[PDB]
């Protein structure tokens, strides 16, 4: 019978040590069976439903929990909620500010004047004068991400406890719901990497025969339409600036990691998508969507809201990128998308629980696979 239970973490990857502290390595979870047994159940017809599934809610809940557990013990940055004195960096002949602070030192009666650089997106003016504040201070507390915690996705396997079983559908053309005529039982799922993204789905699995479009209600414009590609598209993202880190004491063993000086040229972060692969892919997505609408299909840029919705928000290398996608959702060159970067993060719309992402020294190079799209709808 259908059931809702608690599944557990398992990991095939035990390659990493316990010093790198990956957030998804609970180090409380078992290795997977290196040779898992998949059993085909002949003559069964199992009704699957991705929209009413409970594995999604559980995975989501556990991700939130692990995230908070690793963040909780680290240094709070609420002592930095002071008026900031900021001027521009020499982005001269934009978005980086040079700010000074008065901070508490290890002995409470003394204060020190210190400097840090900030991205414009993390700092809001108070006055028309050079008086600024960190954006979270008039709403809530902010916590510094632990400097030693890795957020690189590890495929996580979800396995059932004894008395339960996981069934999977092996029908290559199967959409979100319906009877599956080829169903196997497994000890557990394959590993799914907890990749975080918005407009584009990165580093997931591919459809095997064609683009498969899955929607809870295809006639309801308010629903997310999930498009799974049957071919990946490489996306190359970078943070070209050579960053540095300044370690600032803000209390008795309380360390803050500030963006340090910029070395070399000041350049804009960006992502590279081949134009030809992008267009080929979108021609096929519209072609498949047409099977449900029998109408002309066009794509448009995101329409509004904050960066989390208007841009391609993703993490790479520990850095947080917000890339413009207007040249995608709208020759033979590479499409270069400008990206914005910000350090103050409010994950999963949990406004009031801010996190500060410390700077990473050196340059960042990312390679990712676009495996899908999330679309909504707004005539012939």
């Amino acid at each position, epitope marked *: 019978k259908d059931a809702e239970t608690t599944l557990f973490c398992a990991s095939d990857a035990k390659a990493y040590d316990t010093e790198k502290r990956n957030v998804w390595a609970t180090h409380c979870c078992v290795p997977t069976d290196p040779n898992p047994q998949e059993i085909v159940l002949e003559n069964v017809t199992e009704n699957f439903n991705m929209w009413k599934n409970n594995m999604v809610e559980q995975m989501h809940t556990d991700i939130i929990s692990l995230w908070d557990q690793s963040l909780k013990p680290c240094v709070k940055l609420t002592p930095l909620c002071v008026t900031l004195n900021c001027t521009d960096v020499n982005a001269t002949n934009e978005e980086i500010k040079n700010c000074s602070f008065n901070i508490t030192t290890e002995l409470r009666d003394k204060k020190k004047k210190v400097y840090a650089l900030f991205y414009k997106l993390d700092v809001v003016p108070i006055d028309d004068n050079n008086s600024y504040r960190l954006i979270n201070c008039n709403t809530s507390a902010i916590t510094q991400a632990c400097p030693k915690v890795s957020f690189e996705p590890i495929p996580i396997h979800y396995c059932a406890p004894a008395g339960f079983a996981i069934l999977k559908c092996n029908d290559k053309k199967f959409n979100g719901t319906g009877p599956c005529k080829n169903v196997s039982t497994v000890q557990c799922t394959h590993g799914i990497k907890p990749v975080v993204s918005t407009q584009l789905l990165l580093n997931g699995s591919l459809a095997e025969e064609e683009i498969i479009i899955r929607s809870e209600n295809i006639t309801n414009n308010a629903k997310t339409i999930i498009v799974q590609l049957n071919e990946s598209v490489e996306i190359n993202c970078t943070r*070209p600036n050579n960053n540095t880190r300044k370690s600032i004491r803000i209390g008795p063993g309380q360390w803050f990691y500030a963006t340090g000086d910029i070395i070399g040229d000041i350049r*804009q972060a*960006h992502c590279n998508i081949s134009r030809t692969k992008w267009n080929k892919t979108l021609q096929q997505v519209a072609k498949k969507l047409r099977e449900h609408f029998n109408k002309t299909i066009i794509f448009n840029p995101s329409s509004g809201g904050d960066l989390e919705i208007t841009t391609h928000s993703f993490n790479c290398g520990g850095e947080f990128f917000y890339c413009n996608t207007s040249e995608l959702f709208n020759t033979n060159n590479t499409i270069t998308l400008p990206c914005r970067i910000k350090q103050i993060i409010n994950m999963w719309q949990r406004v009031g629980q801010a996190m500060y992402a410390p700077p990473i020294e050196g340059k960042i190079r990312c390679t990712s696979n676009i495996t899908g799209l999330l679309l909504t709808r707004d005539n012939n």
Partner: antibody
Amino acid sequence: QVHLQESGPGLVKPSETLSLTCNVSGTLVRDNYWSWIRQPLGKQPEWIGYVHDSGDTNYNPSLKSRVHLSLDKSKNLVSLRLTGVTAADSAIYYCATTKHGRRIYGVVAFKEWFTYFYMDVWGKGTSVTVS
Amino acid sequence: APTFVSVAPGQTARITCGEESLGSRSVIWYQQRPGQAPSLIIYNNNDRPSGIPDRFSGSPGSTFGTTATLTITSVEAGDEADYYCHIWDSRRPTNWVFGEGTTLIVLS
């Protein structure tokens, strides 16, 4: 080979307007960018500004308010007009042909580049003394 | 304005000029023989116009924290001159004033 033959009053009084010229021979005035450079005695050269056809003109911000450069397409002359002349303006002045290039350091689409300039042909220059 | 370097003929010169690079740099070097109008030696760090011998070369514009350098191989008597740099830098205002140069004294 172009010859830039400069000319001027030599000796001027304080608060007078200085007008220097440059007879361009072998090339046309509209063929390249023109610039003026001055070198006070005992000092390194100072770039006054540049003038060009197609409207591409710019000035040394410290001199700008007193100076106008121009190109005479009829007489093939390059000229410099400086008002408010003072003792500090005594210098050897030069007419020169300016060539340029571009350096790219980042993404061209984001304008991560700049123009750089150099002076290829210098005239003999003129000596300007302010009483 | 210029400082001095003493080089016996046949010895090399080390001429430096300007402040440290902050970002990509493009250095223009000029040669001023006393009594002469000045002329171009190098543009764009190491590109020389025709007529300039290859004994004249200099520092790359790819480094940061370094200063412009002109190295003259086997200095000749005809190289006695005031060497000046004009510095373009991606993180600075345009320099309308030449940097402080160096007089190359040939000890012949």
